[PDB]
Amino acid sequence: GLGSVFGRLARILGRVIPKV
Incomplete structure (x- = not known):
């Protein structure tokens, strides 16, 4: 990772607060 x-x-x- 990293x-x-x-x-x-x-x-x-x-994917938390996208354009939707």
């Missing part, structure tokens, strides 16, 4: 996972985490930030 940089490799950032790819997935990058979505949770968008």
